[PDB]
């Protein structure tokens, strides 16, 4: 895979709290499709433990309802890099954040072709903040994405941004 975009000098601790799924994007289209897509996730919040591994927080569709669920992606010897354990590898890079406003994240397939990716902007209120935006969009020009969603602040006070 593709992102080589990753925040220098990631202070994970700060990202702790609340944050809202302001838009996403995917490499493939049925990655983010239907309400019930793979990685059509709504992040709730992050808690970093305190030995630096990074515990989420989401809703996600999965009955004809939106469950709750629990990630915890462990800490790798790259500060901005965390892995969530599966049947296959698969890493989260925070790519950009102030920790205040905004936070720019990728998931991947590691590995490798490249193949399959999606990014959110994360931002800490029910707002559209538009230079966060712009921070994603242009983060985004480097990767091969084919969806992407974009929320107003009712969906995002609203459970799977309803
Ligand atoms: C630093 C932002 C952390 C958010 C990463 C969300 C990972 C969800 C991956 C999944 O379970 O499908
Ligand atoms: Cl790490």
Known sequence: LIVTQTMKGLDIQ????????????????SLLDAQSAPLRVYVEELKPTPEGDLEILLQKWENGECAQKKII????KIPAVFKIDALNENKVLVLDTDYKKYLLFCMENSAEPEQSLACQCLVRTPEVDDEALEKFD???????????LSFNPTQLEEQCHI
């Open 138 to 148: 242009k983060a985004l020009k480097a990767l091969p994405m084919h969806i992407r």
């Open 73 to 76: 992606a462990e800490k790798t």
């Open 14 to 29: 700060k990202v702790a709290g609340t944050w809202y799924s302001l838009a996403m994007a995917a490499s493939d289209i």
